Amino acid sequence: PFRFVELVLVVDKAMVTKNNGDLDKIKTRMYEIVNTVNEIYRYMYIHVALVGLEIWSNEDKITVKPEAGYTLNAFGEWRKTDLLTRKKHDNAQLLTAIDLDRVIGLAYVGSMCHPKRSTGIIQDYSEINLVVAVIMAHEMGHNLGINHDSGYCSCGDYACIMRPEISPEPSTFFSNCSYFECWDFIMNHNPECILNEPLGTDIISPPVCGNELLEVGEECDCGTPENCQNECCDAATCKLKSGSQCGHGDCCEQCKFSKSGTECRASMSECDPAEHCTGQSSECPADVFHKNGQPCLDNYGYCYNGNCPIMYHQCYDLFGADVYEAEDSCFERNQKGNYYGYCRKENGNKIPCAPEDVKCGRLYCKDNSPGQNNPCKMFYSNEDEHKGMVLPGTKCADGKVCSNGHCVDVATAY
Ligand SMILES: *[C@@H]1O[C@H](CO)[C@@H](O[C@@H]2O[C@H](CO)[C@@H](O[C@@H]3O[C@H](CO)[C@@H](O[C@@H]4O[C@H](CO)[C@@H](O)[C@H](O)[C@H]4NC(C)=O)[C@H](O[C@H]4O[C@H](CO)[C@@H](O)[C@H](O)[C@@H]4O)[C@@H]3O)[C@H](O)[C@H]2NC(C)=O)[C@H](O)[C@H]1NC(C)=O
Ligand SMILES: CNC(=O)[C@H](Cc1c[nH]c2ccccc12)NC(=O)[C@@H](CC(=O)NO)CC(C)C
Ligand SMILES: [Ca+2]
Ligand SMILES: [Ca+2]
Ligand SMILES: [Ca+2]
Ligand SMILES: [Zn+2]
C-alpha cells in the first residue's frame, strides 16, 4: 500500500560553516526535517526514511553555485557517478547555505529512482525546521512527478506544499491535485526502487515509535494510537500484543508466522530463485539472484541481475510480434558512430563499435509484422537514446555477453 523513499541528504560546506562546524547540530536538523517530511507524505501513502547523510565539512565535492540549474546538474552527475555506486538509496537532496539565484529550491520532475535525476537541491532558507521541511517535501514532490498547483487545486484553507512560492505561514498539506498527479506518475511509470521497505538498521535517524517506520528496538510500529489499525501491535509502545508472533513483514499473516515454505518473493526468471518463509520468522529473506553468467533459457542467454536478457525478447518488447534478431550485417551500422549507431558514450560523445563489439550497440531487428519488410529495424528516440541499445549482459555470441558496450567472454565477464 505504502511506497518508501530511502533518502540520502548531503550538506554543503557553506552550511557547515554557517553552523560553525557543529555536525551534531546539523545532523539533528536533518533528522527533524525528514521526520516532518515523512509526516507530510503520510497523506500520500508514501513513507520517507533517511538512510544516509554526507556532510562536506572539508571541501564540497562539486562546485556549489548560485545558478541553481548548474548546481542541480552537477549534484545529479555526482550522485550518479559517485554516491549511488557506493550507497543504495532512492533519492538524494543537497542542502546549501548558498543563496541560489531566483529560487530557494530546484528539482527534476517525474524522475524518482533515476540515477542522475532522482535529486533536488534545497536552500537552507530558514532556521525554522518546518519551513525547510516544506521546501524538501516540495522538491521531492517534483521528483515524484508533481507539478505546481493552480486553478481549482485545493488542500483546504491552507497554503499547499506545491504552490510556486513558499508561504510565510506554510502548512504541511498537499492539494488534491498533488495527490492524483503523484499517483498517476507512480502507476504509469512505476518507479521500482521505492517498492522495498527499508530495514530498521538501514535508517540512520534516532528511532521514533509512532512514525510508522519499523526501527531498531521496535517489535512493530503502526503510528499513533489514533491511526493504528494493526491489531497485532500496541501503538503507544511499539510492542506486540494479544496472540501475536509478529506484527510486520511479508512472512507475517494475521500476526503469526507464515508456515515454512510459503513463497514470499516470486521468481522473476530462472536466474532469480524465489525466497520462502522459514515458518519461524516474520520477514522474507533478502532477495537472492543466481550468479551472473550462468546459462539460461536453454543456452540462448546468460544470467544478468536476476534476468536472462536475449535479443529475441528485446526485439519483442520494443516492436511487438513477428519481429526477431536481425542478420549480423545489420549490426555493422554500429560502427558508424552516428546518432543511433554506436556502442557507448564518453564525455557525451557517441563511440562507434569496434567490429568485434557491433552486437552490443544499437539493437537491430528483422520486422516481418503485417505488411512490413524491414530487415534492420532499430529503435531510436532522443527522449532517451539508451532505449533500443542492446541490454547489458545480453548474449552476443557463443560464450560471450555484452558488458559496457563490449562483447566479451562470459567466463571472465563476472
Ligand atoms: C480538487 O478539489 C477541489 C475542491 O475544493 C475541486 O474544485 C472544484 O473543481 C471543479 C472543476 O474540476 C469546479 O467545477 C467548475 O466550477 C465552475 C464554477 O462554478 C463551473 O462553471 C460554471 O458552470 C455553470 C454551470 O455548470 C455555469 O452556469 C457558469 O456560467 C460557469 N461559470 C463560469 C464563469 O465558467 C464549471 O463548469 C463549466 O465547465 C464544465 C467543464 O469542466 C462544463 O461542463 C460546464 O458546462 C461549465 O461550462 C465547473 O463545474 C468546482 O467549482 C471546484 N470547486 C470549488 C470549491 O472550487 C477540484 O476540481 C479538485 N481537483 C482535483 C485535481 O481533484
Ligand atoms: C522565496 N522564493 C520563492 O518562494 C520562489 C517564488 C517564485 C514564484 N514563481 C517563481 C518562478 C521562478 C522563480 C521563483 C518563483 N519560489 C521558489 O523558490 C520555489 C521554486 C520551485 O518551484 N522549485 O521547485 C520553491 C519554493 C516554493 C519551496
Ligand atoms: Ca528503495
Ligand atoms: Ca518507528
Ligand atoms: Ca530471489
Ligand atoms: Zn517547484
Give, as one character, the DSSP assignment of residue 109.
S
Contact 150, 230 (CB under 8 A): no
Q: Is 139 a catalytic residue?
A: yes
138 Cα nearest atom in ligand 2: 28
Contact 160, 177 (CB under 8 A): no
Distance 248 CA to ligand 3 centre (A): 18
Which residues lie across from 47 on neighbouring strands? Answer: 4
Q: Which one of 152, 153, 158, 162 would you pick to mutate in the ligand 1 pocket, going by the greatest count of ligand atoms within 8 A of its CB? A: 152
Q: Which helix (H) or strand (E) holds 365?
A: strand 365-367
| CA 167 to the chain's CA centroid | 30
Burial category of 187 from C-beta neighbours within 10 Å (exposed 0-12, middle 13-18, buried 19 and up): exposed
Strand, coil or helix: 80: helix
Distance 55 CA to ligand 2 centre (A): 25
User: Closest Cα to atom 49, ligand 1: which residue?
Assistant: 152
Q: Does 90 appear as a known binding residue?
A: yes
Task: Answer left, alpha or beta for residue 305, where phi above 0 means left and psi between -120 and 50 means alpha.
Answer: left
Query: What is the C-alpha separation between 210 and 153, in angstroms, rounded?
Result: 31
Residue 152: HSE in the Cβ half-sphere, 13 Å Cα cutoff: 0
Angle value at C-alpha 255, between 253 and 258, nearest 5 degrees: 40
In the structure grid, which three cell numbers stand for residue 122, read together?
A: 534545497
Distance 125 CA to ligand 6 centre (A): 15
Query: What is the C-alpha separation between 109 and 120, in angstroms, rounded?
Result: 10
Query: What is the C-alpha separation between 178 and 82, in angstroms, rounded?
Result: 32
181 Cα nearest atom in ligand 1: 63
Ligand nearest to the CA of 205: 4
Distance 87 CA to ligand 6 centre (A): 27
**Cβ within 8 Å of residue 18, ≥6 positions away:** 97, 124
Query: What is the C-alpha separation between 379 and 389, in angstroms, rounded?
Result: 8
Name the resolution in angstroms.
2.2
In one-letter notation, the amino acid at residue 235 is: A
Q: Does 6 appear as a known binding residue?
A: yes
177 Cα nearest atom in ligand 1: 63
Which residues lie across from 11 on neighbouring strands? Answer: 55, 95
Task: Quote the CATH superfamily of domain 1-199.
Answer: Collagenase (Catalytic Domain) (3.40.390.10)
In the structure grid, which three cell numbers stand for residue 11, read together?
A: 550538506
Closest to 325 (Cα-Cα) out of 309, 304, 343:
309
Q: Which residues line ligand 2 (CB under 6 A)?
A: 102-107, 135, 138-139, 142, 164-166
Q: Does 220 appear as a known binding residue?
A: no
Q: Which one of 94, 103, 173 would you pick to mutate in the ligand 2 pocket, going by the greatest count of ligand atoms within 8 A of its CB? A: 103
Q: Does 208 appear as a known binding residue?
A: yes
Q: Does 211 appear as a known binding residue?
A: yes
Would you tell me the crossing angle of helices 23-42 and 129-143 to the nearest 10 degrees? 60
Contact 358, 396 (CB under 8 A): no
**Cβ within 8 Å of residue 335, ≥6 positions away:** 341, 352, 353, 354, 355, 358
163 Cα nearest atom in ligand 2: 27
Q: Does 193 appear as a known binding residue?
A: yes
Query: What is the C-alpha separation between 150 and 194, in angstroms, rounded?
Result: 28
Distance 189 CA to ligand 3 centre (A): 15
Question: Which position among 32, 54, 139, 346 bears the catalytic label?
Answer: 139
Contact 146, 120 (CB under 8 A): no
Q: Which long-range contacts (CB under 8 A, 24 or more apart) does 320-325 make?
A: 320/369, 321/369, 322/367, 322/368, 322/369, 322/370, 322/372, 323/365, 323/366, 323/367, 323/368, 323/369, 323/377, 324/365, 324/366, 324/368, 325/364, 325/365, 325/366
Distance 30 CA to ligand 2 centre (A): 22
The coordinates were experimentally obtained by: X-ray
Contact 183, 196 (CB under 8 A): no
Q: Which residues line ligand 1 (CB under 6 A)?
A: 152-154, 176-177, 180
The domain spans of the chain are 1-199, 200-414
* Distances in whole angstroms, Cα of residue 222 to Cα of each of 46, 207, 251: 14, 14, 17
Contact 273, 280 (CB under 8 A): no
3-state helix, strand, coil in the chain (%, to 5): 25, 20, 55
